[PDB]
Amino acid sequence: RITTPYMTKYERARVLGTRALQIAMCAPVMVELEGETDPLLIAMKELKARKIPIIIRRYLPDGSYEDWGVDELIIT
Amino acid sequence: EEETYRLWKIRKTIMQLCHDRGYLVTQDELDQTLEEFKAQSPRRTDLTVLVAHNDDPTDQMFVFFPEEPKVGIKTIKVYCQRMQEENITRALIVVQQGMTPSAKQSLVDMAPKYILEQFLQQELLINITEHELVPEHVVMTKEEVTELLARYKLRENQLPRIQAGDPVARYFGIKRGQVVKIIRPSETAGRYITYRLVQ
Amino acid sequence: VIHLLLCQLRVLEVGALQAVYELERILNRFIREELEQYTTEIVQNNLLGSQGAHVKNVCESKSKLIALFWKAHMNAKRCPHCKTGRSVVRKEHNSKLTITF
DNA sequence: CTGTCCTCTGGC
DNA sequence: GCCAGAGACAGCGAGTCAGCAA
RNA sequence: UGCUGACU
């Protein structure tokens, strides 16, 4: 509620990596892939459509955390 | 007549030090020149000043200028008596050569009843606080430190430290456990603000 | 010194860092009952801080305290209670400790 | 080949 | 107790390929 | 492991 609204580059990297590792483990792709064999291209296609049900849990230096949605996060 | 120049510089520096601590000092004392200092006042017992505090009018401070180039326990007692009888709590002892080493732990031994503090005479010839590199220090109040720790989710340890013998912690008379705000004039960001716990 | 350092360690174990100089000044202005009251009051009112004690500025203080102890107060000395208790251990090369008469 | 320790030793 | 005499003591760029002898 | 060559 007080951290930045945008998605840092490290968060984009980790979210793409995790979504790709999920797709590669036979997870349903909600993005209507169009003949591409790379799970990372599919993960980028999903991130551009705002279809990723993951919750970035930003940790503050004292243990307190804030749970943001990958949908409710301004991707640059 | 260089003794008078030294006395005047030390008195001006002590007036500035007392104003920076928040004591009632007039503009003339802070803008007093040598020709009028020597006009008013020769001795080293009528240079003693007694200043009042903006709030807590009972809270006043008393500046000493001992005659003995090396103050000792007896010299300290002789005007700790003065303070105890006039009903003041704070003091400031400007010494010309130093304090014999037992005296430093005596000044410390006197509990918050009568808290004293020493300053060498060569330390007051100039106001270090007016150096280009020295930032502005501001003793935070007990209600601003709490809001700071709450905003940054900090503890009082885990904050940068400023030594209790720091030449700018001794000047601003900051006790231990107090947080000081520091306004660094930065060439990069203008007026950077930092915090340091006095310890 | 023994009791002062004991109490300073008791307070450091929980993180209280002003208690160090406060205990030292309480001592100089004044032994176990004088120091243990303040130290127990600190350790009680300032517990919940055993997890927030593994920080720089809390490790430097303990380091300095124990180093100063080992460096300044463990030299051979005539004994307090019996004036002739210096059975001088004096160690040669490692694997060799020699007590005298 | 340098600089702090840093633990004596030794004299005072 | 004040601070020289030291006298230990620890540190000293990154990676790579061989051969030869023990 | 060692030591003697050598590469950037």
Ligand SMILES: Nc1ccn([C@@H]2O[C@H](COP(=O)(O)CP(=O)(O)OP(=O)(O)O)[C@@H](O)[C@H]2O)c(=O)n1
């Ligand atoms: N011992 C070493 C020797 C070399 N190097 C590395 O190799 C580079 C080229 O070496 P070099 O000797 O060719 C210098 P260069 O400026 O390229 O030479 P030039 O003037 O002839 O063009 C150096 O700058 C280092 O990064 C190293 O890490 N350790």
